[PDB]
């Protein structure tokens with residue numbers, strides 16, 4: 001009972017965060033086995049960050065230019081290399097708290113937990129979604145660069161996001177752990193805009209099922225619609241179209257509530273055309289789109 | 302603003318499973334003591350009207366199964382303190398953090414580590430409501446999950462989850478086993494009082510709005526604390542205490558807006574409604590003055 005924005009327990013990840021400093025530039029890094037991963041932006045001085053030539057900046061540095069701090073313990077850098085936008089620092093000590101982990105690239109619409117860190121110290125955890133325009137609406141202050149996003153799958157930590165930068169609208173941009181940006185961004189200190197965002201329709205529907213499970217039912221009606229007729233209206237309002245794969249993924253929540261997906265779509269279509277009219281759903285006055293169907297199942301089953 | 306929880310790692314290493322018979326729930330292992338709800342000593346026929354003193358007399362140390370994962374911790378002593386059982390085990394937990402037990406007041410926020418079978422499953426932030434419930438998220442098997450705050454290096458444990466009420470909200474104790482609210486640990490339907498809006502947290506949210514440049518609602522007038530408190534009651538808002546005025550001081554200083562001037566602004570919103578938004582069309586009441594500062598400054 002109840003419904004909350006829930007993150008995964010962060011303990012497996014907390015043991016892997018460190019501070020990386022190069023000159024006076026400092027940020028957070030991720031220590032797994034005997035490698036520290038961090039944004040390559042750390043090798044920039046203040047002059048370099050506007051238009052960095054990273055290959056050049058990197059050849060001009062040596063192992064002892066890198067100061068890696070794990071709490072009070074100092075790790076010794078014995079090698080380094082660039083992979084896209086992520087620096088890989090080989091250190092002489094393996095992390096004994098290394099979890100079972102893999103690196104994954106997630107898709108727009110999917111959610112993950114963010115461990116926000118400052119000077120190598122974990123400070124907060126929260127859940128967010130990859131937006132369709134490849135940004136995330138995070139909560140980050142100066143010094144958060146290199147914080148990571150992750151999901152837990154039984155015993156295995158899937159790392160999917162490494163935080164790089166804030167955009168002028170206050171949303172955030174980053175890479176996967178292979179160093180490739182989500183979206184059309186580049187790791188330099190220039191003002192960059194994102195593409196236009198859309199609402200994640202399959203997530204809205206999952207959240208409407210959670211509301212029904214928790215007793216909020218005022219928006220239901222006895223009508224149904226077809227997939228195509230629903231998608232025409234959704235497109236009009238800048239909602240993502242629904243595919244048959246989405247209909248399948250909502251199956252378990254449709255079975256648990258007895259409300260068919262296309263029946264829910266008919267409710268959502270009415271909401272798009274007429275609004276909430278001052279009513280709320282699960283305490284929200286806006287349609288929430290950052291819970292996946294799987295998120296809802298974890299919390300309501 | 303996100304609802305952001307504290308990192309849970311220091312607490313995850315203290316979670317265990319406690320079983321008595323087939324009744325199972327979560328416990329908290331600190332040093333050589335396991336804390337858990339005393340409801341664990343009930344069979345199904347006892348849960349509706351348990352005589353805890355009678356049930357405990359018939360229990361021996363060797364009736365308690367305490368497991369950290371698959372590893373059994375042998376119980377060498379037991380006592381009951383209000384609604385929590387304290388189980389002395391033969392192993393001091395080597396992951397015990399620096400910790401203290403605190404009793405929080407309504408309006409205060411904390412992180413909840415939701416656990417099932419002694420295994421951590423999710424973390425989230427919530428506030429204690431003025432009617433001493435929490436609007437949590439808990440399924441069956443979550444009894445004994447704990448709520449906490451982190452102050453620097455030290456974990457402050459403030460909440461042990463016990464039960465779900467008929468309206469779907471949740472009730473529990475502090476770590477000395479004293480319930481928050483007028484509830485009792487039996488399987489009967491119990492009603493919580495009517496909830497009110499947490500005024501001190503609404504004021505913190507209005508200060509955060511001002512800090513970020515959103516300040517249309519600031520009005521030219523001031524009020525007294527007594528006038529404000531009597532108005533708030535009429536709208537199902539909590540009256541302010543002297544402690545509330547004090548914890549708002551830093552935000553007042555940062556913005557140069559006196560607390561009572563902000564109260565006069567809220568009073569207007571209460572009597573006239575809003576038309577535009579703030580930051581949202583709804584006034585948020587689960588961010589404390591500490592939460593605001595922690596997310597705006599660090």
Ligand SMILES: Cn1cnc(Cn2c(=O)nc(Nc3cc4cn(C)nc4cc3Cl)n(Cc3cc(F)c(F)cc3F)c2=O)n1
Nearest residue numbers: 024025026041140141142143144145164165166187188189
């Ligand atoms: C407000 N906010 C929200 N998220 C962020 C993340 N972030 C950050 O933490 N730091 C950045 N630049 C740095 C400045 C430094 C000054 N010192 C002494 N050391 C510093 C290290 C960093 Cl990383 N930036 C900006 C930024 C970081 C990048 F990785 C990048 F490729 C381009 C950028 F413009 C930043 O966004 N701040």
Ligand SMILES: Cn1cnc(Cn2c(=O)nc(Nc3cc4cn(C)nc4cc3Cl)n(Cc3cc(F)c(F)cc3F)c2=O)n1
Nearest residue numbers: 323324325340439440441442443444463464465486487488
């Ligand atoms: C849906 N929901 C949300 N929160 C809760 C919390 N909660 C819980 O997890 N378990 C409870 N009763 C038990 C039944 C058991 C069956 N077995 C085999 N073992 C069991 C152990 C427990 Cl604790 N309850 C009910 C409950 C628990 C109490 F501690 C109490 F004092 C009164 C109560 F009615 C419960 O609310 N479920």
